[PDB]
Design a protein around this motif. Structure first.
Motif, short mmCIF file in Angstrom:
data_model
loop_
_atom_site.label_atom_id
_atom_site.label_comp_id
_atom_site.label_asym_id
_atom_site.label_seq_id
_atom_site.Cartn_x
_atom_site.Cartn_y
_atom_site.Cartn_z
N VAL A 70 -31.55 39.76 68.22
CA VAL A 70 -32.85 40.41 68.14
C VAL A 70 -33.71 39.51 67.26
O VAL A 70 -33.54 39.48 66.03
CB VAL A 70 -32.77 41.83 67.58
N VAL A 71 -34.54 38.71 67.88
CA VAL A 71 -35.36 37.79 67.12
C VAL A 71 -36.77 38.31 67.05
O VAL A 71 -37.45 38.38 68.06
CB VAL A 71 -35.33 36.37 67.70
N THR A 72 -37.20 38.70 65.86
CA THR A 72 -38.55 39.18 65.66
C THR A 72 -39.23 38.34 64.60
O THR A 72 -38.57 37.67 63.83
CB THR A 72 -38.57 40.67 65.25
N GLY A 73 -40.55 38.32 64.59
CA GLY A 73 -41.24 37.62 63.52
C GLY A 73 -42.46 36.79 63.78
O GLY A 73 -42.82 36.53 64.91
N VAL A 74 -43.10 36.33 62.71
CA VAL A 74 -44.33 35.55 62.86
C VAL A 74 -44.01 34.12 62.47
O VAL A 74 -43.55 33.86 61.35
CB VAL A 74 -45.46 36.12 61.99
N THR A 75 -44.27 33.19 63.39
CA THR A 75 -43.92 31.79 63.20
C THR A 75 -45.11 30.91 63.54
O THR A 75 -45.84 31.17 64.50
CB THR A 75 -42.71 31.39 64.07
N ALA A 76 -45.30 29.86 62.75
CA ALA A 76 -46.34 28.87 63.02
C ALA A 76 -45.83 27.50 62.61
O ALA A 76 -45.50 27.28 61.45
CB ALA A 76 -47.63 29.20 62.26
N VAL A 77 -45.84 26.55 63.56
CA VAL A 77 -45.33 25.22 63.30
C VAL A 77 -46.29 24.11 63.58
O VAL A 77 -46.92 24.10 64.63
CB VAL A 77 -44.12 24.91 64.20
N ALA A 78 -46.44 23.18 62.65
CA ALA A 78 -47.25 22.00 62.90
C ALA A 78 -46.26 20.85 62.82
O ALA A 78 -46.24 20.13 61.83
CB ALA A 78 -48.35 21.85 61.88
N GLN A 79 -45.45 20.68 63.86
CA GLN A 79 -44.37 19.68 63.82
C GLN A 79 -44.82 18.23 63.72
O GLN A 79 -44.16 17.44 63.08
CB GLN A 79 -43.42 19.88 65.02
N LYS A 80 -45.93 17.88 64.34
CA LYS A 80 -46.43 16.54 64.28
C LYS A 80 -47.88 16.73 64.45
O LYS A 80 -48.31 17.67 65.11
CB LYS A 80 -45.91 15.70 65.42
N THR A 81 -48.68 15.87 63.86
CA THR A 81 -50.11 16.08 63.94
C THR A 81 -50.75 14.76 64.18
O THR A 81 -51.73 14.65 64.90
CB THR A 81 -50.68 16.74 62.68
N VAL A 82 -50.17 13.73 63.58
CA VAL A 82 -50.72 12.39 63.78
C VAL A 82 -49.56 11.44 64.04
O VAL A 82 -48.57 11.44 63.30
CB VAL A 82 -51.54 11.93 62.56
N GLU A 83 -49.70 10.61 65.08
CA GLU A 83 -48.71 9.60 65.38
C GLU A 83 -49.39 8.26 65.55
O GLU A 83 -50.43 8.17 66.20
CB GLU A 83 -47.96 9.94 66.65
N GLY A 84 -48.84 7.21 64.96
CA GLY A 84 -49.40 5.88 65.07
C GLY A 84 -50.70 5.74 64.30
O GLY A 84 -50.92 6.34 63.25
N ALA A 85 -51.58 4.91 64.87
CA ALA A 85 -52.86 4.62 64.25
C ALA A 85 -53.83 5.77 64.49
O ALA A 85 -53.45 6.85 64.95
CB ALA A 85 -53.41 3.29 64.78
N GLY A 86 -55.10 5.55 64.19
CA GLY A 86 -56.10 6.60 64.31
C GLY A 86 -56.21 7.41 63.04
O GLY A 86 -55.69 7.06 61.98
N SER A 87 -56.91 8.54 63.16
CA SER A 87 -57.15 9.40 62.01
C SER A 87 -57.66 10.75 62.48
O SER A 87 -58.08 10.91 63.63
CB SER A 87 -58.16 8.76 61.04
N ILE A 88 -57.60 11.72 61.57
CA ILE A 88 -58.27 13.01 61.75
C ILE A 88 -59.28 13.15 60.62
O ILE A 88 -58.91 13.50 59.49
CB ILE A 88 -57.27 14.18 61.77
N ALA A 89 -60.54 12.88 60.91
CA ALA A 89 -61.56 12.82 59.87
C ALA A 89 -62.43 14.07 59.88
O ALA A 89 -62.84 14.55 60.93
CB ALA A 89 -62.43 11.57 60.05
#
Lengths: 99, 99, 99, 99, 99, 99, 99, 99, 99, 99
Positions: A70-89
């Motif tokens: 019985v799996v219940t619950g609130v889950t939030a995952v940010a497993q990867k957000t940036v890979e390699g070059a670039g940016s989040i500006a």
């Protein structure tokens, strides 16, 4: 005589970058039984179930077997957000007056 | 005579970068039975279940076997956010007047 | 005598970039039994089920076998948001007066 | 004497870029039993089911076998949003007066 | 003496780009049993089912076998939004007065 | 060898007079809220009123004026059972063997 | 060898007079809210009124004026069972063997 | 060897007079809300009124004026069972063997 | 060897007078809301009124004026069972063997 | 060897007078809302009125004026069963073997 917030006055070749509540690559989750609820003179027999429930008022026997999961619950995952070059500006500015 | 907050006055080739509540690569989770709830003269028989429950009022026998797993809960993971080169910039500014 | 917020005055070759609540690559999830609810003199027998339930008032026997899985819940995942080069820009400005 | 918000005055070759609630590559999900609900002197016997339910008032025997899976819930995924070069720009400005 | 919001005054070769609630590559889902509902002196016996239900008032025996899967819920996925070069631009401006 | 109760054996010209629970000129009154009552697993909200009552659960003002008389009660009167000659006889016997 | 109750054996010119629960000139009254009542697993909201009642659950103002008389109760009167000569006889016997 | 109750054996010129529950000139009254009542698993909202009642659940104002008389109750009167000569006889016997 | 009740054996010129539950000049009254009532698994909203009632569930104003008389109740009167000579005889016997 | 009840054996010139439940000059009254009633799994909204009633569910104003008399009830009167000479005889016997 300038009254200003989150800005810029006078100057020359000016850059203004403002970010408010700017969400980038975010994961949000929320599970709420009640939010912004108002009871005024109210008689409520309520009941919220998230999973497995066995409810009765008058009984003789009452079993609840859970052989599995019985799996219940609130889950939030940010497993990867940036890979390699670039940016989040967010709110990024520049003035390069080179030659 | 400038009254200013989060800004810049006078100067030359000025850069203003302001970030407020700027969420980048974030994971959020929330599980709340009650939030912003107001009871005024209210008679409530309530009941919130997150998992396995066996509820009764009058019974003779009452069993609850859990042979497996009951996984409940609030989870938030930011396992990786930046890989390799690049950046996650918030409120970043610059003035390079080179030659 | 300019009163301004999130802006720019005077200057020359100015750039203004403002982002408010700008969501980019975001995942949102929400499960709420009640939101913005008002009860005024109300008698309610309510009941919300998310999963497996066995409800009765008068019974003799009452079983609830769960041989399998009961997966309930609120989930939000931002597994990847940026790969390789490029960017996710919000409120980004620049003035390059080079030669 | 200009009172302005999210803008720009005076200047020369000015750029104004404003984004409000600008959603780009976002996933949203919401499951709500009640939202914006008002009860005024109301007697309600209600009941919301999300999954498997076995409801009765008077019974002798009552079984609920779940040999399989009961998957319920609110899910939102932003698995990938940007791949390779390019960008997702919101409120982005520039003035390049080069030669 | 110009009072302006989300704009630009004076200047020369000016660009104004404003985006409000501009949704690009977004996925939205919502499942709500009640929204904007008003009860005034109302007696309602209601009942909403999302899945498998077995409802009775008077019974002797009552079984509910689920050998298979019961998949219920609200889901929204933005699996990919940008591939390769290009961009998704909202409120983007520029003035390049080069030679 | 006679075993006898409330009687007479042998003798001659015998008289037997027996009175059990013999009520003559009697007044009986009884007021009982409960008599011979059995509660087994019972949830009762009860309320017995003999007179003037003002009952409420939620109120702002609550008055009860009694300008007159409230006569309640159990009364029984035996005022003049015998008058003049005569008698009220119970279990009375005689043997007058005169001449 | 006679076993007898409330009687007479042997003798000669015998008289037997037996009175059981013999009611003569009697007044009986009874007021009972409950008699010989059995509750087994019962949920009862009951309410007995003998007089003047003002019952409410939710109110603002609540008055109960009694300008007159409220006479309630159990009364029984035996005022003049016997007058003058005569008698009220129960279980009375005699043997007058005179001449 | 006679086993007898409320009788007479042997003797000569015998008289047997037996009165059981013999009611003569009696007044009986009874007011009972419940008698010989059995509740087994019963949910009853009951309400008995003997007089003047004002019943409500939700109200603003609630008055009950009693300018007159409210006479309730159980009454029984035995006022003049016997007058003058005569008698009220129960179980009366005699043997007058005179000359 | 005679086994007898309320009788007479042997003897000579015998008289047997038996009265059981013999009612003479009696007044009986009974008012019962319930008698010999059985509830088995029953949900009853009942309501018995003996007099003046004002019943409501939702109201604003509620008045009940009683300017006159409300006479309710159980009454029984035995006022003049016997007058003058005569008798009311029950189970009366005699043997007068005179000359 | 005679087994007899309410009788007579042997003897000579015998008289047998038996009265069971013999009602003479009696007045009986009964008012019962329920007698010999059985409810098995029954949902009843019932309502018995003896007098003046004003019943409503939803109202604004509600008045009940009683300027006159409301006479309800169970009454029974035995006022003058016997007058002058004569008798009311039940189970009366005699043997007068005179000369």
């Amino acid at each position: 005589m300038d009254v200003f917030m989150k800005g810029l006055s006078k100057a020359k070749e000016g850059v203004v970058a403002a970010a408010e509540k700017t969400k980038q690559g975010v994961a949000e989750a929320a599970g709420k039984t009640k939010e912004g609820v108002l009871y005024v003179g109210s008689k409520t027999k309520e009941g919220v179930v998230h999973g497995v429930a066995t409810v009765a008022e008058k009984t003789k026997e009452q079993v609840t077997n859970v052989g599995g999961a019985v799996v219940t619950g609130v889950t939030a995952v940010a497993q990867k957000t940036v890979e390699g070059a670039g940016s989040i500006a967010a709110a990024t500015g520049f003035v390069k007056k080179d030659q």
